[PDB]
């Protein structure tokens, strides 16, 4: 994973996202959704999804939320106050903690001013607590600004490392982008049964055709402009959509 003071930032893009494999995986110790409850994720579409990744203590997962304070949310990683995405977190004691102490996971513990939301700060200047200038050397009131979790496998819970992923769905002003996947059902030909063919919504009896589209045409229309044939996306065969029976 990535440190907590320099988190990563992956920009998921145009794709088919299935948040159900996430939501039901039962391997996550924390799955909170803020802008939008979790089950309705596989039914919406946005412009961009960002995914941020890092590693923190066990009991600092409560500062990854809109409107908190503490050493992590103050100056390591700040979430805006109208967040939209979801926060996922799971314990990772066996991967990240090693006997003798894993001193490769640092965090920032001194900064001049709290972060703006989604702002990032990887500098390593000597912090200056008191009024006396520091001149790049340590000493009283002149502190190195980074400390390291020394993770060890015999740590009580709440001191073992947790890995965190923060998904943030954003909607700029584009034309569209990633959305969930659409299911499908078997096709029953010959029976006024409601239907949906990748967007075409209708009603009627479906029947095997004997017309021949051109190999880029989806559905056929009549004079007076009513849909009367379709092509099945999966098997690519033409079926006449005769209106239902009435009189």
């Amino acid at each position, epitope marked *: 994973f990535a440190s907590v003071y320099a988190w990563n930032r992956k920009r998921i893009s145009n794709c088919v996202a299935d948040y159900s494999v996430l939501y039901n995986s039962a391997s996550f110790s924390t799955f909170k959704c803020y802008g939008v409850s979790p089950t309705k994720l596989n039914d919406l579409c946005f412009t961009n999804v960002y995914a941020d990744s890092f590693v923190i203590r066990g009991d600092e997962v409560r500062q990854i939320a809109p409107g908190q304070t503490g050493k992590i949310a103050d100056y390591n990683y700040k979430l805006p106050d109208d967040f939209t995405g979801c926060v996922i977190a799971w314990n990772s004691n066996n991967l990240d903690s090693k006997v003798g*102490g894993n*001193y*490769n996971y640092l965090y920032r*513990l*001194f900064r001049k001013s709290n972060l703006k939301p989604f702002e990032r700060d990887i500098s390593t200047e000597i912090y200056q*607590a008191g009024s006396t200038p520091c001149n790049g050397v*340590e*000493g*009283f009131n002149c*502190y*190195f600004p*980074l*400390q*390291s979790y*020394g993770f060890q496998p015999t740590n009580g819970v709440g*001191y073992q490392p947790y890995r965190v992923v923060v998904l943030s769905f954003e909607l700029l002003h584009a034309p569209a982008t990633v959305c969930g996947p659409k299911k499908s059902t078997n096709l029953v030909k010959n029976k006024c049964v409601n239907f949906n063919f990748n967007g075409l919504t209708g009603t009627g009896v479906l029947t095997e055709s004997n017309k021949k589209f051109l190999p880029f045409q989806q559905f056929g229309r009549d004079i007076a402009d009513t849909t009367d044939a379709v092509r099945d996306p999966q098997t690519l065969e033409i079926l006449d959509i005769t209106p239902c029976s009435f009189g």
Partner: antibody, heavy 128, light 112 residues
Framework: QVQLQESGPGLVKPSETLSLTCTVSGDSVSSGSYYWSWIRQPPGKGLEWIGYIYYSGSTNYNPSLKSRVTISVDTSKNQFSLKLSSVTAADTAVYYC????????????????????WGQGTLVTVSS | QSALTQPASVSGSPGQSITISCTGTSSDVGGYNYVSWYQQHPGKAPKLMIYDVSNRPSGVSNRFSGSKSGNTASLTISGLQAEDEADYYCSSYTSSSTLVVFGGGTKLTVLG
């Protein structure tokens, strides 16, 4: 400025578990930036080091006094305290509490030096 | 390991100069830049006046100064007074396990 004071004395017997408690005034414990420690000194002899706690809960101890001493933090009354168990007759010493500066390491524990303000020191004896 | 404070006792005449050495083991105590000195009056808590290896904190006498050479550390004074009779200890940050080591103590006397 800052001040330190120890408490919890008493003619402790042999094979007990004594507890000293150092309280701080003028600086919060959970602020980072300083590591609170413990130093004993037997009478007529030199100093030796015992342990430290950081505000997170990270501990360290002397390996000669290892598996015998636990030190813990209270952030509610701004104090920290040790407990040393199975006391022999050699621990009749003066016990100071002080804070350390503890410069930043490099992926391998943090090094500390110089210290700062030493407690007041409360002689603690062990006899019958 | 223990950075033997060179000599145990020490004699001095009031006014001129005293230098106290502090040798130890290898670059885990000497070849680092972290040594400190402490003055303990008889019946009181000790008090630092020298840190890092040669830095005076906020308000001490200017007679106090130290230096480093190889595996030995030095502390010197530049003019003695009657109130400077105490013990003196060295510190040091090793890498072994005892984290921080301590001196054995030198007794400064004001003969005269």
């Amino acid at each position: 400025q800052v001040q330190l004071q120890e408490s919890g004395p008493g003619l402790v017997k042999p094979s007990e578990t004594l507890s000293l408690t150092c309280t701080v005034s003028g600086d919060s414990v959970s602020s980072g930036s300083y590591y609170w420690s413990w130093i004993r000194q037997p009478p007529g002899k030199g100093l030796e080091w015992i342990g430290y706690i950081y505000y997170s809960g990270s501990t360290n101890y002397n390996p000669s006094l290892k598996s015998r001493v636990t030190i813990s933090v209270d952030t509610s009354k701004n104090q920290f305290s040790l407990k040393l168990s199975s006391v022999t007759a050699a621990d009749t010493a003066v016990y100071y509490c002080a804070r350390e500066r503890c410069y930043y390491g490099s992926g391998r524990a943090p090094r500390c030096v110089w210290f700062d303000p030493w407690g007041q020191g409360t002689l603690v004896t062990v006899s019958s | 390991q223990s950075a033997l404070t060179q000599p145990a006792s020490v004699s001095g005449s009031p006014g001129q100069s005293i230098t106290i050495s502090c040798t130890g083991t290898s670059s885990d105590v000497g070849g680092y830049n972290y040594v400190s000195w402490y003055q303990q009056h008889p019946g009181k808590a000790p008090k630092l006046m020298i840190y890092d290896v040669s830095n005076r904190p906020s308000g001490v006498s200017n007679r106090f100064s130290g230096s480093k050479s190889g595996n030995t550390a030095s502390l010197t004074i530049s003019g003695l007074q009657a109130e400077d009779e105490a013990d003196y200890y060295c510190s040091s940050y090793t890498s072994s396990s005892t984290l921080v080591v301590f001196g054995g103590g030198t007794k400064l006397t004001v003969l005269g």
